[PDB]
Amino acid sequence: VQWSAEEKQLISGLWGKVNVADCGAEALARLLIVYPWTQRFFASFGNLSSPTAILGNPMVRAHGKKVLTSFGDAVKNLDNIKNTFAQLSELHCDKLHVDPENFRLLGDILIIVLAAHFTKEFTPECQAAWQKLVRVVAHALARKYH
Amino acid sequence: VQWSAEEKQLISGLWGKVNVADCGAEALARLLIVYPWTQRFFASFGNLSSPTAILGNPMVRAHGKKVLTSFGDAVKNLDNIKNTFAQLSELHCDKLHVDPENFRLLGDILIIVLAAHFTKEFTPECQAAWQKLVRVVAHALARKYH
Amino acid sequence: VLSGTDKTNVKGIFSKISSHAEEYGAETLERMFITYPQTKTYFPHFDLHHGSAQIKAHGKKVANALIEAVNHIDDISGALSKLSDLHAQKLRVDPVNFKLLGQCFLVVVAIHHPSALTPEVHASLDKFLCAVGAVLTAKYR
Amino acid sequence: VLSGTDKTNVKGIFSKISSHAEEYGAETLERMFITYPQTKTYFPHFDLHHGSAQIKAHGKKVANALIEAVNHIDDISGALSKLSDLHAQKLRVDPVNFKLLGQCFLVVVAIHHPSALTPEVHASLDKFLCAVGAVLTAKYR
Ligand code: HEM
Ligand code: HEM
Ligand code: HEM
Ligand code: HEM
Hints:
heterotetramer, A: mainly alpha, C: 141 residues, mainly alpha, Globin-like, 67% helix, globular, oxygen storage, oxygen transport, Hemoglobin, Avian Species
């Protein structure tokens, strides 16, 4: 994948401002509320019984931070993404068997959460660069299926 | 992707028996009939206004054959699929803009055509190997999107 | 929506499938497991070996549920409402999986009734399996 | 389907628009064209530069269709059924494209109404957009 100077600037620009912990908690929790089937991978996390339960859940909140941190690792090495996510691709693909379609729904939610946090600062060019990012991340995360 | 001895056998054994012209034409016609939005890419082909017309269309029939000859290029060089399909990826991705979801649907249709043509010889093990080959072909053909 | 022709096609091809319903369900299931092994995670309680009694028995049920939907083709949602609760609410079946099961069922019909699975019957069957998939995941919607 | 709570959630956030159909529809499309450039293929006849008059005019129609659907939320089909002919039969819009636009609409909402796009309202809005998408691609089924 090719990253233009402007894309790189839009990505690193926004990333410096991102509340990894809250945006992270929010994105994961939205995933489980909006796409209720994904709750199945998170049976270990306990009570996923209501939107309020999911938003209230400490393991949901804590896992969210680390998923977003791991997106941060992509931001931090845009040209080495496929390697950065290899060990995570095996876990997701071989150990957990998560359909890659869901990597895509997570990316989309992250866009919406980043939209809400950044408001008008989340310009069309910015949505476009960040969407590409979550796309490149989903693809690297799926490569153990191929 | 790795290839077992058993898979390599199931693919090559069956391929030698495939009617490329007929299975090719049929799989392309079924694509157009079951998923009519794929007709948009085939306006140069003329009359696709009904199933009968689609099945009678010589350009559909002739393109159908080339598509299956192409799958045979994959069969013929199973470890070198990514490179075999590279120009075709630029075409379908860079020039034609085909959503890769349609690569999956075509492969699904081709598996169904192989099933009808081979009946009980299309064993579960055989399906699993053939489904796998089309999945790797579609993945190689989506390479220019990534 | 399924047209009147769609319904006749489906009704018709199920008429050739009725006597072998149970066998076909089991074969679809078995095909799904080997072709799409990740679907097995939903069946940790089953002996997943080809020809096991649990697959054979489950396969009969699945084929019967489709036959029941064909019998209430005018209103599939009314006839399979129960199964939606099971699949979406209790089981958390990932929506991608329904296409995998539908594909295998199509492989099975093609294998046993090739002349009968013409491109148009194929079109209508696909539509039908999709609607049924749509009912069973309606609790997500 | 959409629960009484969903219908309530959607109408609420659509009231919060609400005099902003023109600008939100336009923004939705602009975002769609830059984020997913492949969707530009359906508009060869438009000037696709940001803020073009055609996009402004078109975004107005898209938003008003969505408002008309919020208005007749008990029978969305009934109200937007004429659009399926256009999208599916005439335009042959690939079904994948409906999610993309939905995605952009949700973003445009999040940007303007960040506190009102609660996970529950986001879920209900998702349900609504998918049901709209289902009506527009209905001539595919
Ligand atoms: C596409 C973006 C994603 C990224 C960047 C990502 C990243 C991560 C990371 C960093 C971990 C940490 C591993 C650990 O500490 O055990 C993880 C684990 C996990 N992921 Fe994701 N993931 C993604 C998508 C998904 C999706 C879509 C699902 C299912 C809907 C999922 C299911 C899981 C589960 C069940 C775990 C382990 C939970 C546990 O046992 O503690 N992941 N992922
Ligand atoms: C899934 C595996 C596929 C394979 C192996 C394949 C193979 C080929 C080959 C060998 C060509 C020859 C290039 C040419 O004649 O211009 C071609 C062209 C083309 N492909 Fe595909 N294809 C696949 C999928 C698809 C799909 C799903 C679509 C659209 C729904 C599509 C749309 C086209 C079109 C419109 C052309 C050019 C037709 C022409 O004007 O000559 N292809 N493909
Ligand atoms: C549209 C296609 C499907 C139909 C018609 C269908 C029908 C059924 C039926 C009739 C039952 C039995 C309810 C009972 O035990 O009385 C059932 C249960 C079940 N289904 Fe499905 N189903 C479908 C799709 C799926 C898919 C795609 C999966 C996952 C790949 C799945 C996994 C299961 C599981 C795990 C059970 C519980 C099995 C048990 O404990 O006995 N089903 N389904
Ligand atoms: C569910 C979301 C959508 C809604 C509510 C919607 C609504 C509309 C409306 C109200 C019109 C005008 C109809 C008329 O003037 O007769 C229209 C036309 C059109 N739509 Fe959509 N649409 C949606 C999705 C899409 C998507 C995803 C695409 C393609 C990416 C698309 C492409 C078009 C095109 C090319 C026209 C013709 C516009 C023109 O030439 O002026 N629509 N749509």
